[PDB]
């Protein structure tokens, strides 16, 4: 009998443990793998896929194919916002249910650069210039082009190219941010504006739609695996 002494932890069951255990089906000859297309190796691979943003979660158009369409028009120039959004990838209503947002909710901490892409779905004869902006936290959220202008921004020429990408670079005080709305780890403000205005000729539609997309850049990562609130069994009993 080799003399042993039991330590604390003995006989416990930690659901996150990693030990060997006896096989119930000994000598079982497994079916070989085949080269199935589309293998995934990391959840972050998925987070890097651009999925479409539910921007207009307005009362009447949420939970409908409309929530995805941001409407624009040939209207006169204004310095007022086309859309205002907060950089809370996991907790903001508009971002939270995107593929990125969903994966972010199985984790507690995130870090990295985000990538926003806008697609102009209006007509070929339509022209215009828009201003896309990102404002790092700590000041009044931008309500006017004049202030959005002052932060990180891009000027998009609709007429020249149909789509436009803007990278929101990782800038944070903390090493990582939390996957919940929390002032301490806030990320800032994304907003879009009319630089000039949408201009169309006669015999052509004066209103059109833009679609928007988000995904993670390759510098991105997450930590502390956790259960999500985005699904449940309330009726369950465990």
Partner 1 sequence: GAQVSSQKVGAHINYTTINYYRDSASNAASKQIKDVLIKTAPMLNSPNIEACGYLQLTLGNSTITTQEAANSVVAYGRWPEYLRDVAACRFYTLDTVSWTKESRGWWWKLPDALRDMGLFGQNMYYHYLGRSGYTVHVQCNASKFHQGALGVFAVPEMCLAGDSNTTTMHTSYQNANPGEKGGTFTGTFTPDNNQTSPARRFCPVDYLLGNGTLLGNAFVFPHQIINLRTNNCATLVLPYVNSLSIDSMVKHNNWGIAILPLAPLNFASESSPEIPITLTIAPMCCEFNGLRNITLPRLQ
Partner 2 sequence: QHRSRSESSIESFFARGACVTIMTVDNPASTTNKDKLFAVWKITYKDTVQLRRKLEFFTYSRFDMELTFVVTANFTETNNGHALNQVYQIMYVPPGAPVPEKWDDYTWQTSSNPSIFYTYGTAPARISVPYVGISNAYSHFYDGFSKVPLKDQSAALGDSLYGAASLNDFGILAVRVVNDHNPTKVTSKIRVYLKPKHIRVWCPRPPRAVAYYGPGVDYKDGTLTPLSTKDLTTY
Binding residue (CB under 8 A) for partner 1 from 68, 91, 108, 199 = 68
Residue 214 Cβ, how far from partner 2 at the closest point, in Å?
Answer: 14
* 149 lies in the binding site for partner 2 (CB under 8 A): no
In angstroms, the CA 178 to CA 109 distance is 5
Q: Site residues for partner 2, window 194-233 (CB under 8 A)?
A: 219, 221-233
* 58 lies in the binding site for partner 1 (CB under 8 A): no
- Which range in 22-30, 112-120, 150-158, 196-204 contacts a copy of itself by CB under 8 A? 22-30
Query: Under 8 Å CB-to-CB from 137, ≥6 apart: which residues?
Result: 186, 187, 188, 189
* 1 lies in the binding site for a copy of itself (CB under 8 A): yes
Residue 184 Cβ, how far from a copy of itself at the closest point, in Å?
Answer: 16
Angle at 63 between CA 102 and CA 53, to 5 degrees: 50
Choose from partner 1, partner 2, a copy of itself, none: what does 160 bind? Cβ within 5-8 Å by kind.
none
102 three-class SS: helix
CB-based burial of residue 39 (10 Å sphere; 0-12 exposed, 13-18 middle, 19+ buried)?
Answer: exposed
């Amino acid at each position: 009998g080799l003399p042993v002494m039991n330590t604390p932890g003995s006989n416990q069951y930690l659901t996150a443990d990693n030990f060997q255990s006896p096989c119930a089906l000994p000598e079982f000859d497994v079916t070989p793998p085949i080269d199935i297309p589309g293998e995934v190796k990391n959840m972050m691979e998925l987070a890097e896929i651009d999925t479409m943003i539910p921007f207009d979660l307005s009362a009447t158009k949420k939970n409908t194919m409309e929530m995805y369409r941001v409407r624009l028009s040939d209207k006169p120039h204004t310095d007022d916002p086309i859309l205002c959004l907060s950089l809370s990838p996991a907790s903001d209503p508009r971002l939270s249910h995107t593929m990125l947002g969903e994966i972010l909710n199985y984790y507690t901490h995130w870090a990295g650069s985000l990538k926003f892409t806008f697609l102009f779905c209006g007509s070929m004869m339509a022209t215009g210039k828009l201003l896309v902006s990102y404002a790092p936290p700590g000041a009044d959220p931008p309500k006017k082009r004049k202030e959005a202008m002052l932060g990180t921004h891009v000027i998009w020429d609709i007429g020249l190219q149909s789509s436009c990408t803007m990278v929101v670079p990782w800038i944070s005080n903390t090493t990582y941010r939390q996957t919940i709305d929390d002032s301490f780890t806030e990320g800032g403000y994304i907003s879009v504006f009319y630089q000039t205005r949408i201009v169309v000729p006669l015999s052509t539609p004066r209103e059109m739609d833009i679609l928007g997309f988000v995904s993670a850049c390759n510098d991105f990562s997450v930590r502390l695996l956790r259960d999500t609130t985005h699904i449940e069994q309330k009726a369950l009993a465990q």
